[PDB]
Amino acid sequence: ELQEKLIAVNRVSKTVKGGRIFSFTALTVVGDGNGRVGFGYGKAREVPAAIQKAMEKARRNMINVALNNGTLQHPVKGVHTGSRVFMQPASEGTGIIAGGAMRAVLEVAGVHNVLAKAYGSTNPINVVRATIDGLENMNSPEMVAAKRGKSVEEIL
Amino acid sequence: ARYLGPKLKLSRREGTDLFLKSGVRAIDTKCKIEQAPGQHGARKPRLSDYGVQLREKQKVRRIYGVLERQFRNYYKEAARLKGNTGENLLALLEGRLDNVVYRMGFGATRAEARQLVSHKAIMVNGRVVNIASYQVSPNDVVSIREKAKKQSRVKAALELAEQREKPTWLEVDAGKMEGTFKRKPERSDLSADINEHLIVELYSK
Amino acid sequence: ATVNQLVRKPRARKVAKSNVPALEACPQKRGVCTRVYTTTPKKPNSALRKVCRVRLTNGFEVTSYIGGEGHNLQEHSVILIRGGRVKPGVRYHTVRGALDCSGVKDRKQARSKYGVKRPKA
Amino acid sequence: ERDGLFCARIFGPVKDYECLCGKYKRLKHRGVICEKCGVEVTQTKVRRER
RNA sequence: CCCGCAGAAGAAGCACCGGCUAACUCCGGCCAGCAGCCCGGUAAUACGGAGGGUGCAAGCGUUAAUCGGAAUUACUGGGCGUAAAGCGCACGCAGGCGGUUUGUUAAGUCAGAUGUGAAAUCCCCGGGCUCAACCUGGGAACUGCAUCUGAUACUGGCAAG
RNA sequence: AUGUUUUUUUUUUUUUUUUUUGAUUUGGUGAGAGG
Ligand SMILES: [Zn+2]
């Protein structure tokens, strides 16, 4: 039922007395095609192991996102470190208009229809985080009503 | 202006059966449908994000037999039109005269249908239409003319169709050899394997 | 930045100069070879790269790379240059198979890019 | 046989969640019936009750 | 435009396949050559040829040129302790902005109308050329400008606090 | 007293078993024996 996308895998080095010890970082993201999303960042001497670790990480510490049908509920900005991200709800049929790491996270989340630009840095790890933040902060109509002491029809 | 080469190769490349051959003989017997074409067929590494989309696009294009510029134009039209873009595009594709003919069962393959259309066999509302890209409208009867009604190929095609599932959005008569395009098809009526969304995304680069 | 400031003095558009100014917004230009020679490229590469100093129609004296394997060019040979820089001071390529510059011999792939006619058989 | 005693469309697919002829080889669209297959898409014991 | 005649007949190339970037193998020595940015010194998927593939297709590449990507002049929409970026510090004219209450005005602001904003073009619904491009009917739009009639919260003017 | 004073590529691959709700495959007829 859960779908899992390895966004990026990057080789990182540590210099020691002998020379360079290489290792691999795997950035993954998992989701159930509904609100639940979670990214994981795993590290190991070999790639597959790292990926596995990342997946494991992702599977715990997931996060829920309120989705009005296939799309978002309102335009939402999300920032994290360099990567600042804008994403805007869009009409059925338009698809996920978004770039790179950002796209992957959206896809797993089960948003089908978005218009999304990543300003600033596009460092996958940061940008995915930013996206997640954006998703998280995004409140629903019901939630807003609850907050404000009103009905849903009062808010429209 | 047409793809004239090996048809099964395309299918192999795609992965699926594209219905580029009549369906008398099963596709697995005619070719290694699982294995990709060329010297490096058995090797199959996971494709990129762009690449998958591209592949999807190709598949659809291949299925209908529409070259790139035309496809692009169609996409644009769909975008312009109200409602879901991918769905619209699909509808447009369906609407093609040759495609309609194929659906009806006057052509064994889509290629055959196209050929028939070209050769002034088909009429739309009693007027000979020669263009394969002709967008057939709702309530537009489309028939074989009396000259081409004697052809053995047509009957074979019909027979083949009869084995094949009948589309709900048409109504065809085997004896009269005239079908009514009743309505533009819903997305549910078409094949589920086609990811229109990917195609849409590809052009929304 | 401040709106008032902007009003006072608006934002300057970055004027990007053309990296092929001897063309003067022409797709190609005709030129006569003042001299033809080989030159050694900068680090880390190693070769004798064939190049010709060309006096152009519009008056400029430039130096143009000669692509492909082998060339017929001499001094006083009328050639067409197209723009494109080889990665010191060469910002143009001779169009092979135009005017006096010949197509490359015995070439069968990317033939267009070296002026070569289709091989008959 | 399509369509004889032991049909596809009238009853169900021999294999579980598979079009016997060729489409749906995972667990996403359980139900679609293409014209090339004229087949339902359910369980292996679904034909025992139909 | 239509009808008849014959016979698969007269009709497919161009670029690319190291990564970005869809497509991989074999055979020929930092040369010959490639290159948009980041190969070649004898097992080169990067040079040249072949076979195989990929993308476009009566075109296909290259060059030039413009916008885009470039939130990389940032009105929308950036910054300035260390990355480029706070005048060495002040005073201060012009300029910009201006606490609070009432009254008034109605300049800004908002609303409605009238006149205009050529036609074509763009966009919407239609129609006509077998379809399409193309042609074409009606609409919408032309974000504005002017004038008249209102509204007076906010900003401004004037008067008193 | 002093060090940019012998660098050359000796190069990286994007979705199933969801912490114990799931796969190893054999139908009638007739004859004979044990209790
Ligand atoms: Zn099926």
What does this structure look like?
The structure is cut from a larger assembly and holds chains A (156 residues), B (205 residues), C (121 residues) and D (50 residues). Chain A is of the alpha+beta class. Chain A is 31% helix and 35% strand. Chain A is built from five helices and seven strands, in the order E-E-E-H-E-E-E-H-E-H-H-H. With 205 residues, chain B is α+β, with helices and mostly antiparallel strands. Chain B has two domains: 7-93 and 190-204, Orthogonal Bundle (Ribosomal Protein S4 Delta 41, Chain A, domain 1), CATH 1.10.1050.10; 94-180, Structural Genomics Hypothetical 15.5 Kd Protein In mrcA-pckA Intergenic Region, Chain A. Chain C is mainly beta and 121 residues long. Chain C has a single domain (1-121), classed as OB fold (Dihydrolipoamide Acetyltransferase, E2P), CATH 2.40.50. Chain C is built from one helix and four strands. Chain C has one helix at residues 3-8, and strands at 29-39, 49-56, 61-65, 78-81. In chain C, a hairpin with a 4-residue loop joins strand 2 and strand 3. Chains in contact: A-B, B-D. At the B-D interface, loops of B face loops of D. Zinc ion (ZN) binds next to loops of chain D. Chain C binds two RNA strands through helix 1.
Structural class of chain C: mainly beta
Radius of gyration of chain D: 10 Å
Based on secondary structure, the structural category of chain D is: little secondary structure
CATH homologous group name of chain C: Nucleic acid-binding proteins
- Largest interface: which pair? B-D, 12 and 13 residues
Number of strands of chain C: 4
Rg of chain C, Å, rounded:
20 Å
What is the tally of helical segments of chain D? 0
The count of domains of chain C is: 1
| Oligomeric form | part of a larger assembly
Side-by-side strand order of the widest sheet of chain C = 3-2-1-4
Spatial shape of chain D: globular
Number of helices of chain C: 1
What is the CA-CA span between the terminal residues of chain D?
17 Å
Order of helices and strands of chain C: HEEEE
Q: Which architecture name of chain C does CATH use? A: Beta Barrel
Largest sheet of chain C: 4 strands, antiparallel
Helix content of chain D: under 10%
Number of strands of chain D: 0
Tell me, what's the shape of chain C?
A: elongated
CATH topology of chain C: OB fold (Dihydrolipoamide Acetyltransferase, E2P)
